Curated annotation (Swiss-Prot), chain A:
Gene source species: Mycobacterium tuberculosis (strain ATCC 25618 / H37Rv)
Region of interest: Repeat 1: 5-70
Annotated ranges, domain Clp R: 2-144
UniProt-recorded name of the protein: ATP-dependent Clp protease ATP-binding subunit ClpC1
Function: ATP-dependent specificity component of the Clp protease. It directs the protease to specific substrates. Can perform chaperone functions in the absence of ClpP. Degrades anti-sigma-E factor RseA in the presence of ClpP2.
Region (Repeat 2): 80-144
Coiled-coil positions: none
Family recorded in the similarity comment: Belongs to the ClpA/ClpB family. ClpC subfamily.
Outcome of gene disruption: Depletion experiments (using anti-sense RNA) stops degradation of anti-sigma-E factor RseA.
Length: 147, 7
């Protein structure tokens, strides 16, 4: 199903792996998806998070606080966590229900808050972005693009 | 799909 991801959504997922690698992490978790959505910096997900005051630095600090880094950066393919897998599966249905045949950055973000339980969700709540508020912000920005 | 980037 990655073939239905937009270019930018694929770049998100590719960057999430490197977010994990550069923290000396050995799985790609939901929090690395969150880092990648913000760090890629152009799509509706990034805009939605910026517009709620969720910054790359705030997320990095919470990931250091909650997870911490390993001793060494791994080479080769880093596997998705169970919850990251769930997020990416959910993203497909967020896209279809919003009337899209491709999975964009916003649908990954929506999948992440739909999953609602892993490290990224914990970080968003800690930083003051309640999951319903995040969802409604995405809907609000998408509605503005219908003009 | 769905274990690694991008399988």
């Amino acid at each position: 199903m990655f073939e239905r991801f937009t270019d930018r959504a694929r770049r998100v997922v590719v960057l999430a792996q490197e977010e994990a690698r550069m923290l000396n992490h050995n799985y790609i978790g939901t929090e690395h998806i969150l880092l990648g959505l913000i760090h890629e910096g152009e799509g509706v997900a990034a805009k939605s998070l910026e517009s709620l005051g969720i910054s790359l630095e705030g997320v990095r600090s919470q990931v250091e606080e909650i997870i911490g880094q390993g001793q060494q950066a791994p080479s080769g393919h880093i596997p998705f966590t169970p919850r990251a897998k769930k997020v990416l599966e959910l993203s497909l249905r967020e896209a279809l229900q919003l009337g899209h045949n491709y999975i964009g950055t916003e649908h990954i973000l929506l999948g992440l808050i739909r999953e609602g339980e892993g490290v990224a969700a914990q970080v968003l709540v800690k930083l003051g972005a309640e999951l319903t508020r995040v969802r409604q912000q995405v809907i609000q920005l998408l509605s503005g693009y219908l003009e | 799909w769905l274990a690694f980037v991008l399988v």
